[PDB]
Amino acid sequence: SFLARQLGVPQPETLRRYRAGEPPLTGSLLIGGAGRVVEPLRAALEKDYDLVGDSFGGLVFDATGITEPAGLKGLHEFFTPVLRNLGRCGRVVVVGGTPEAAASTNERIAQRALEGFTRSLGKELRRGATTALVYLSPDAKPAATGLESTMRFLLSAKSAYVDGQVFSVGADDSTPPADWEKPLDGKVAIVTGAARGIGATIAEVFARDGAHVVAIDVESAAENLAETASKVGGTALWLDVTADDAVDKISEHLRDHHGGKADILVNNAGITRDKLLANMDDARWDAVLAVNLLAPLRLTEGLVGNGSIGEGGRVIGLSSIAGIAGNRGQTNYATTKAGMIGITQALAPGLAAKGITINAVAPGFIETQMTAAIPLATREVGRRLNSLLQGGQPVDVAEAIAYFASPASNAVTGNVIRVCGQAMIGA
Amino acid sequence: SFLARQLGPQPETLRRYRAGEPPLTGSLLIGGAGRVVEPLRAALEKDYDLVGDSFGGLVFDATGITEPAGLKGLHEFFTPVLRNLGRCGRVVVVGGTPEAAASTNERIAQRALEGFTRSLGKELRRGATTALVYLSPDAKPAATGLESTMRFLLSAKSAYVDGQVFSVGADDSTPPADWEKPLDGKVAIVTGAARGIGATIAEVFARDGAHVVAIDVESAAENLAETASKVGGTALWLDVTADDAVDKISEHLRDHHGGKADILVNNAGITRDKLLANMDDARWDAVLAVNLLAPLRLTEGLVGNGSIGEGGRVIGLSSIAGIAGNRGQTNYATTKAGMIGITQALAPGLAAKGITINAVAPGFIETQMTAIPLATREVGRRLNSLLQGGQPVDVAEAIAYFASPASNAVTGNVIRVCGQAMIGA
Ligand SMILES: NC(=O)c1ccc[n+]([C@@H]2O[C@H](COP(=O)([O-])OP(=O)(O)OC[C@H]3O[C@@H](n4cnc5c(N)ncnc54)[C@H](O)[C@@H]3O)[C@@H](O)[C@H]2O)c1
Ligand SMILES: NC(=O)c1ccc[n+]([C@@H]2O[C@H](COP(=O)([O-])OP(=O)(O)OC[C@H]3O[C@@H](n4cnc5c(N)ncnc54)[C@H](O)[C@@H]3O)[C@@H](O)[C@H]2O)c1
Secondary structure, three states, X not given: XXXXXXXXXXXXXXXXXXXXXXXXXXXXXXXXXXXXXXXXXXXXXXXXXXXXXXXXEEEEEEOOOOOOHHHHHHHHHHXXXXXXXXXXXXXXXXXXXXXXXXXXXXXXXXXXXXXHHHHHHHOOOOOOOEEEEEEEOOOOOOOOHHHXXXXXXXXXXXXXXXXXXXXXXOOOOOOOOOOOOOOOOOOEEEEEXXXXXXXXXXXXXXXXXXXXXXXEEOHHHOOHHHHHHHHHOOEEEEOOOOOOOHHHHHHHHHHHHOOOOEEEEEXXXXXXXXXXXXXXXXXXXXXXXXXHHHHHHHHHHHHHHOOOXXXXXXXXXXXXXXXXXXXXXXXXXXXXXXXXXXXXXXXXXXXXXXXXXXXXXXXXXXXXXXXXXXOHHHHHHHHHOEOOOOOEOHHHHHHHHHHXXXXXXOOOOOOEEEEOOOEOEOO | OHHHHHHOOOOOOOOOOOOOOOOOOOEEEEEEOOOOHHHHHHHHOOOOOEOOOOEXXXXXXXXXXXXXXXXXXXXXXXXXXXXXXXXXXXXXXXEEOHHHOOOHHHHHHHHHHHHHHHHHHOOOOOOOEEEXXXXXXXXXXXXXXXXXXXXXXXXXXXXXXXXXXXXXXXXXXXXXXXXXXXXXXXXXXXXXXXXXXXXXXXXHHXXXXXXXXXXXXXXXXXXXXXXXXXXXXXXXXOOOOOOOHHHHHHHHHHHHHOOOOOEEEXXXXXXXXXXXXXXXXXXXXXXXXXXXXXXXXXHHHHHHOOOOOOOOEEEEEOOHHHHHOOOOOHHHHHHHHHHHHHHHHOHHHHHHOOOEEEEEEEOOEOOOOOOOOHHHHHHHHHOEOOOOOEOHHHHHHHHHHHHOHHHXXXXXXXXXXXXXXXXXX
């Protein structure tokens, strides 16, 4: 952090990321509040976590009990005497009931208001700690199995760069994977743009979690793609995702390798022909659309509609912060990455009725060749302009994607999660 | 200072409203394809120079784009003409409500537009601004309910609203007698109006025809009197958090305005910043009570006893902090997300009743609160596309737009007045 003097900014925390064998949080877990979540959750986490009843690993507050704005006082009552004790890379999650679904307008106002609390708290925490808000459907049964994959993602090292975000967990029940630490056991994952970078690390994490990976890139990058296939022990596929025949060239690979079925599609491939719109030609427009928006919609509609992905399937699309907040010289790119959010939102109901979920991850600043291609000052500021005072890592994005891919994450669809470390920029 | 230099800023002096001056710096060019271009050309022919010099405004009808391949339309219209956009020009893309699209393709493409407008917002020079307006595909072809939004955007009134998303329903609209005296004959209750923003909300309302009930607390007596005097309104002392609050306002409306008021403004707000780990009951409770409990109490109360009925308008004051959070403001932002909460929650019910409810989230606004040290003041001032802080008028204008009798199809809305501040969710 070489400009910490210039921008009056703290040294960053070394963010704790996932290691097999290590406990999920580094302290004890406090589950307070009142409502229909405190007891179930206390119950679901007894064994894997360290429930009070030193230093707090986690702080979960149950806001579902708060049915009017006057109840909000509780956030205060619970949080104030404990923040003093939140350990390194601690985890604070408020859980509320879906505001549009609330039993009163009064209730709805209190639950909506929660975001202001969580995102503000995100900005006060220290030494690597992060906040999250999670809404749960009031039609969720009292055990709330559908909430588990989400709580377990946040209440761990994996959500290391997920900060100040809002998760929406629907009403369906869920079944734990056989092994929370091998959640994608015997799953078939297609990962486009897997030669290098984020796509590659998706593959790695997927494979670490138990999945068989189909690593797609173009022939130009086969070598790095061979290197990825090897390392996850998956299979390569040389393919332009924009080609008429692409959907067919994937189903056939599935037919020769995987009984013709897949469980997970990750639309990760992308390109960035940047330029100001005043100076934008047709070719720099079209390419970006083709790769970035036209293809993922087609691979999604294609593979589902040809039966390659069916019940229990998962589709995670790679959005971007530019897609939400906009970015100078990226009217093409930000249109595609906004469209990506379109696909997630537009397709979710139809796919829901097919037992398929779809979500998007919007990465923030991530160390990659591409951030490495930005002028160093502009680059360094960018790297530092977030609650967590540093740039993300490709693992941090893959994690978010692997939380979505989870078989227990079935109650979570239509979600867009930023992996930005609570970057200051946004809509 | 080095980083200043290294990074590359030339703030345009922003053009604001002035009785008499054209609403644009040049001709309006309305293009694209779909259900909005023809009606808009006809609605706007009188007061605007349509392109049958340089571009005062550009409006692109995107409602005709039904698939992502069609997005390229945006590029074919804007690329060629952008170079000719003037000082404080306006760019507006009109689309169909994505959730209400006739296909998922359409939904994708239409949702995608915000990427475009927010980004373009960030490219425009000379203090020009971009906006996205979504129109219910259920609006009649006439598109009467859109006009008030098009006039507010396509004017200097909207000088500090940039990069925003406006969402317009299906309902038909009647235009005011006089677009320049929009609130003529209206009675507005503006709370927190002794100083700054509220005080300015009272002026703008006067300028537009309203009889203003300027409200404040006892301590503020002196500055209230000045407001009420300046705007030809009448003054009311009360603390909005009093149990008799609704009753006292109601007593006033009988004595002075036939029991009726048309618009309620929950402007009254206060801070009390403290890190949450040093937050006490008083600092929590005071803010909650003034900023969230009160505004609701007033609205529900004032609709519920009939003081504000059919044609009514409640505009509430959010804040970017309630959108993006902010250090030392768990209490404050809880309440201003609360305000959005009030807005989104009371909207269906208030619609069924003939009342629209909307919110405004100011950015950084030159005011007496903003007593913030130079270090911080300087960067919040400059961290938006317009490269400067905003004036109270810029906010009150936005509020006046909502408040128009012609803004009936506009409800549910939260609009930031931030000159597209970088900070958000
Ligand atoms: N900071 C970041 O690097 C960052 C931040 C936000 C979002 N993203 C997004 O995340 C995704 C991965 O990030 P990245 O920077 O590694 O992207 P990238 O530009 O490096 O592209 C990823 C891979 O996809 C491949 N690809 C391009 N066109 C293809 C096509 N026609 N068919 C098959 N493969 C194709 C490329 O060869 C490349 O190896 C991208 O969609 C990007 O837009 C990245
Ligand atoms: N000033 C900004 O840059 C900005 C930014 C974000 C949000 N806002 C919001 O806009 C509003 C206006 O604030 P401002 O910046 O002009 O500062 P301000 O405090 O001067 O204006 C608030 C007014 O409300 C009055 N007030 C306070 N409590 C009251 C009560 N109990 N009953 C009646 N009146 C009461 C005060 O007397 C004052 O006149 C606030 O709600 C604020 O949260 C302003």
